[PDB]
Write a protein that binds this ligand. Structure first.
Ligand SMILES: C/C(C(=O)O)=C(/O)SCCNC(=O)CCNC(=O)[C@H](O)C(C)(C)COP(=O)(O)OP(=O)(O)OC[C@H]1O[C@@H](n2cnc3c(N)ncnc32)[C@H](O)[C@@H]1OP(=O)(O)O
Ligand SMILES: C/C(C(=O)O)=C(/O)SCCNC(=O)CCNC(=O)[C@H](O)C(C)(C)COP(=O)(O)OP(=O)(O)OC[C@H]1O[C@@H](n2cnc3c(N)ncnc32)[C@H](O)[C@@H]1OP(=O)(O)O
Ligand SMILES: [Cl-]
Ligand SMILES: [Cl-]
Ligand SMILES: [Co+2]
Ligand SMILES: [Co+2]
Lengths: 139, 139
């Protein structure tokens, strides 16, 4: 079952500049940074709060590592802004299988590696009224 | 201080169809619905979780009441998708005054009425790396 908003994925041209804007304007600190070569992103997680299911909610700031990537293509077309939303679950494999059985396109057979060792999948935005939708089980 | 993600604002052509997609696909229920004539929206709040600051996080589904509105114009230009993000605070007036003092454009002098009697303001998306950003104090 999906038990939280895990994160808001925000695409930006310059991660270091955008991280500084969040820190200076709101006082949000960097929880974690990493590069995901498979996804083609340099990412910064800013933790905003903890959640009633035992997890947390983050802003996930993303800069593309290459133009030919999900976020590189999206930035080229749309400019900086919200790229995806992510829901947390204790069992991404089971929740993904249930949602596949409703005819929503699940982009990965098997969950892949996301932030901080998480296991992730995505739902096609054209099946979700225009919202690229991530499912996340934390490590 | 901003202590939670309050909500994700999602623009849609047909609120009743989009609410049904969230209910059928994820099991999310309607927490509240209302019309905001000033903002030009018919809205549905779906509660996803409670938050460590005592508040909650929602999906805010929005259908425009008229074409000449924030959401009507955005839908016309961009199609269905994420429209804004909202941060919760115990004192929207003070947090708005601090952010005004950093040169980020605050759209309302005085917080206005939002969902469930809340007091809200917005930050200009061109000052926030492309993200229309709401500040919310719950009633
Ligand atoms: C690591 C991490 C984490 O949480 O752990 C992350 O979040 S990594 C985050 C980065 N990774 C990902 O996003 C992986 C999942 N995304 C993808 O696989 C792809 O971006 C998708 C969904 C398939 C789309 O393919 P592609 O990038 O090749 O562009 P596309 O040209 O195929 O676009 C197909 C249509 O979908 C629309 N479209 C594309 N990206 C979209 C988005 N982010 N939100 C809403 N709509 C979107 C686009 O406007 C096209 O619509 P029209 O037909 O033109 O109207
Ligand atoms: C009740 C409730 C609740 O929580 O309680 C709600 O949330 S009600 C939610 C609905 N209410 C609101 O959104 C009120 C706040 N929004 C506004 O006042 C306006 O939409 C804004 C920000 C000023 C923009 O003005 P307008 O609608 O007239 O369109 P615009 O043509 O002025 O656009 C100016 C530029 O800003 C860009 N722009 C417009 N809306 C945007 C959005 N949602 N996210 C990111 N960028 C956006 C647009 O692409 C233009 O960029 P280019 O220069 O072309 O690149
Ligand atoms: Cl990697
Ligand atoms: Cl009203
Ligand atoms: Co993500
Ligand atoms: Co809102």
């Amino acid at each position: 079952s999906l038990t939280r908003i895990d994160h808001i994925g925000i695409a930006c041209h310059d991660l270091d500049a955008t991280v500084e804007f969040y820190r200076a304007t709101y006082g949000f600190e960097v929880f974690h940074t990493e590069v995901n070569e498979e996804q083609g992103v340099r990412e910064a997680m800013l933790k905003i709060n903890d959640t009633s299911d035992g997890g947390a909610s983050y802003l996930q700031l993303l800069e593309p590592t290459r133009e030919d990537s999900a976020v590189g293509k999206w930035l080229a077309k749309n400019g900086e802004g919200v790229h995806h939303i992510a829901f947390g679950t204790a069992d991404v494999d089971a929740d993904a299988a249930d949602i596949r059985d409703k005819g929503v396109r699940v982009l990965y057979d098997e969950p892949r590696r996301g932030s901080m060792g998480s296991r992730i999948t995505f739902l096609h935005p054209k099946d979700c009224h225009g919202v690229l939708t991530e499912l996340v089980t934390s490590a």
